[PDB]
From Swiss-Prot, chain A:
Residues the record marks as active site: Y155
Reactions that this protein is recorded to catalyse: 17beta-estradiol + NAD(+) = estrone + NADH + H(+); 17beta-estradiol + NADP(+) = estrone + NADPH + H(+); testosterone + NADP(+) = androst-4-ene-3,17-dione + NADPH + H(+)
Gene3D superfamilies in the record: NAD(P)-binding Rossmann-like Domain
GO MF annotations, alphabetized: 17-beta-hydroxysteroid dehydrogenase (NADP+) activity; catalytic activity; estradiol 17-beta-dehydrogenase [NAD(P)+] activity; estradiol binding; NADP binding; NADP+ binding; protein homodimerization activity; small molecule binding
Gene name as annotated: HSD17B1
Designated name of the protein: 17-beta-hydroxysteroid dehydrogenase type 1
Mutation effect (L149V): Alters substrate specificity
List of residues binding NADP(+): 9-37, 65, 159
Protein family: Belongs to the short-chain dehydrogenases/reductases (SDR) family.
Alphabetized UniProt keyword annotations: Cytoplasm, Lipid biosynthesis, Lipid metabolism, NADP, Oxidoreductase, Phosphoprotein, Steroid biosynthesis
Outcome recorded upon mutating S134A: Abolishes phosphorylation. No effect on 17-beta-hydroxysteroid dehydrogenase activity
Pathway: Steroid biosynthesis; estrogen biosynthesis
Amino acid sequence: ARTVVLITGCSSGIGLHLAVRLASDPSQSFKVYATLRDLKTQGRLWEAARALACPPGSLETLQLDVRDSKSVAAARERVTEGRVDVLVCNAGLGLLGPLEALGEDAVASVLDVNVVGTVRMLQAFLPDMKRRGSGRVLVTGSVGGLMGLPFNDVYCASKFALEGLCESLAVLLLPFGVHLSLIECGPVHTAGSPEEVLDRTDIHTFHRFYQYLAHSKQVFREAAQNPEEVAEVFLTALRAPKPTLRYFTTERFLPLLRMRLDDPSGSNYVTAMHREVF
Amino acid sequence: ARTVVLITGCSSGIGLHLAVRLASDPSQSFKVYATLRDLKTQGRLWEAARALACPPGSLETLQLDVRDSKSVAAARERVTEGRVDVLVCNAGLGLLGPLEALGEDAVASVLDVNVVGTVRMLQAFLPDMKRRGSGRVLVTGSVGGLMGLPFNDVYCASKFALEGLCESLAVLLLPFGVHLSLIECGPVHEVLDRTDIHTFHRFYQYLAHSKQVFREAAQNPEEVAEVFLTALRAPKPTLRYFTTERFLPLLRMRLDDPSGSNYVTAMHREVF
Ligand SMILES: NC(=O)c1ccc[n+]([C@@H]2O[C@H](COP(=O)([O-])OP(=O)(O)OC[C@H]3O[C@@H](n4cnc5c(N)ncnc54)[C@H](OP(=O)(O)O)[C@@H]3O)[C@@H](O)[C@H]2O)c1
Ligand SMILES: NC(=O)c1ccc[n+]([C@@H]2O[C@H](COP(=O)([O-])OP(=O)(O)OC[C@H]3O[C@@H](n4cnc5c(N)ncnc54)[C@H](OP(=O)(O)O)[C@@H]3O)[C@@H](O)[C@H]2O)c1
Ligand SMILES: C[C@]12CC[C@H](O)C[C@@H]1CC[C@@H]1[C@@H]2CC[C@]2(C)[C@@H](O)CC[C@@H]12
Ligand SMILES: C[C@]12CC[C@H](O)C[C@@H]1CC[C@@H]1[C@@H]2CC[C@]2(C)[C@@H](O)CC[C@@H]12
């Protein structure tokens, strides 16, 4: 008799603020299963939720580790109500560095948590939404999944890959009744070391990582959003009668980006994004 | 003297054909190390390079598992000249089916061959190119890395993944004189027991659509190779080459709607 929601990576940041945002809706429509890597880290979730007056039964925490099929099947099992209406695939990592200085196991993890991670869930959860003929899936995007970023090559790869996977299903889902959707965030707040690092790369590349580092601090300062501003927008896409494939949490990158799309050779983008950075 | 090319997945298709367009151009300027997962698979390379009067030492073969970096290191040790000039990352895999029908070692395996493999090669060969301040890297792309495709959810995942990997590198290398490019190709010439029955229906509906698509639009590897050569003789190269014009209306449409839902509505009808 409620909207049943299930969110990955709810110990901090966007998962968190979406979990509490939704459990405390004054509609009291949402039954929210907030899942977490490691439940030992569930304190902040529940300090926030208490704080927010979430009526009880309105929020539950479950364990779930995206790297693991079992955990995913095991949280599936603990849904009580027997259905999901919203499923939000939110857990994710970054990776930052000169490609060359990047460890092949860090590259593996980023890929598992961010792409394959989102595969397992949709594997475990889409069947039944397809069956019912109902469901909204909401998918934490990144401006890094819309245009390439120097020193985030592997991170960008995992972002573009989910835009990839999601667009592909959204094509297919459209007459099933399932409505998959990407929420696209620039920097959000409540956000290795150089020793090692000159060692694994050349001095011009190292100099430019520094420029890179200095310019993305300025961008954080200027342009990071509260997680609350951001979870507001996941609400909207789930309120929507006809959901679109993408929501933007901001228009700020909306020009460096039409620049990408007004030129498919990509030479305008690569000049413009390089000036803007370096 | 000669431009040293090193090609991945030379046992057939694109790689095979480019290896032998290069070793055998009337210029005589290319020297081509054509790498293959295993050599047991080479007779056709060699037959094809024989079909073509490739001069000796215009073409050595190597083995290169792109999933294994030691073998990336092994094939690197074997450029005699001590420099690669052109690098082609071509070795690729498909994976078609209903997303839930998919094996976890297959998903993993498509991403480790297509994305991680390409990463291991750039990590092995771009250092030396940056230090010199020159080099071309050409990456074989797809139109499935440009837009999303029913029942190739996971395959487009890894092609989109090399787009953003190669775009990010592109921004860094601009001022090194090191030039990376993507040749975006359209087509080039159990299940039930995993998946429901209206999914399993229209994964026919979908294959009927590609069949008549390949037939109106397929391109041979010799036509593709010519984009590869067009891109590597360019003075001032772009990040993307399009082996064809068929798909750029769907793509301007995908572009013209950031929002996403036109493209999805175009593409759904198109195929269903
Ligand atoms: N932070 C920003 O500046 C920003 C900007 C744009 C977009 N975003 C996007 O939002 C998402 C999350 O970023 P956020 O920090 O704002 O929120 P978030 O909810 O904290 O998401 C990151 C989360 O991933 C989870 N996670 C890590 N490994 C996991 C695993 N193996 N299995 C399951 N979950 C795992 C972590 O907590 P658990 O213990 O819960 O699992 C963590 O909460 C990403 O997909 C990202 O694209 C963030
Ligand atoms: N076929 C089409 O219709 C088409 C259309 C558009 C774009 N393309 C693109 O072109 C590329 C190749 O397709 P193709 O069949 O036309 O040419 P291709 O040169 O045959 O590339 C596929 C190759 O990948 C190699 N490979 C597989 N696993 C590998 C591994 N572990 N390590 C190294 N290499 C491995 C295979 O031979 P090895 O033994 O040599 O390694 C095989 O030759 C892809 O990246 C794809 O996007 C093809
Ligand atoms: C990487 C960040 C932050 C984390 C979030 O995942 C994505 C955004 C994308 C926009 C980035 C910003 C960092 C700095 C960049 C590169 C600016 O120079 C222009 C675009 C900015
Ligand atoms: C997967 C393929 C083939 C291998 C090549 O490397 C990439 C292309 C992309 C174009 C595909 C084609 C298969 C059929 C598709 C999916 C049709 O639905 C419309 C466009 C076609």
